[PDB]
């Protein structure tokens, strides 16, 4: 059975929060790569590449902080 | 007679005490109407799982 913890439940909220960005990025790139000279294409890909950047930085930082809270509590069981 | 009986019965009970009889049985069951695995459906609103 696919097992998921609490950190998994946390990171998953971002993935479901952005419905299709994961796909849109690849679609926009594939368009642009065909015709790297259309400003409407370039402006679109700039916007969606930078939304894709901020998405994953916010994800990994917030997954780290909960690990540090858990390890801090666990260390006091002794 | 009495002494022999009580001795023999106590010692046989201790000897059988060492034997296990909870034989584990393996059964193989086919499913005819459905898939065996869990499945995930990614609704827009939720990640959903069926066990």
Domain range for A57 is 1-78
Q: How far is B28 from chain A (nearest CA, A)?
A: 20
Which helix or strand (DSSP H or E) is residue A59 part of?
A: helix A39-75
Cβ separation A12–B44 shorter than 8 A? no
Do you know the residue count of chain A? 78
Resolution in Å, one decimal, please. Answer: 3.3
Taking CA–CA distances from A9, the nearest residue in chain B reads B47
Domain count, chain A: 1
Nearest CB neighbour to B47, from listed A1, A12, A19: A12
Query: Going by C-beta distance under 8 Å and a sequence separation of 6 or more, which residues neighbour residue A14?
Result: A55, A58, A59
Integer CA distances (angstroms), A51 to A31, A47, B28, in order = 18, 6, 52
The two three-digit tokens of residue A49, written as one number: 């590449």
Query: Is the CB of B42 inside 8 Å of chain A's CB atoms?
Result: yes
The two three-digit tokens of residue A66, written as one number: 């909960």
Q: How far is A18 from chain B (nearest CA, A)?
A: 10
Taking the CB of residue A25, how many other CB atoms lie within 10 A of it?
A: 16
Between A and B, how many residue pairs show a Cβ–Cβ distance under 8 A?
Answer: 10
């Amino acid at each position: 059975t696919p097992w998921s913890g609490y950190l998994d439940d946390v990171s998953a909220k971002f993935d479901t929060g952005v419905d299709n960005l994961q796909t849109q990025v690849t679609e926009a790139l594939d368009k642009l790569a065909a015709k790297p000279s259309d400003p409407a294409l370039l402006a679109a890909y700039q916007s969606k590449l930078s939304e894709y950047n901020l998405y994953r930085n916010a994800q990994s930082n917030t997954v780290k902080v909960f690990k540090d809270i858990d390890a801090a509590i666990i260390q006091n069981f002794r | 007679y009495v002494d022999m009986v009580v001795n023999a019965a106590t010692m046989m009970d201790k000897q059988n005490d060492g034997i296990e009889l909870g034989r584990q049985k393996i059964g193989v069951m086919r499913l005819n109407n459905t898939f065996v695995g869990d499945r995930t459906y990614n609704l827009r609103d939720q990640k959903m799982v069926i066990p």
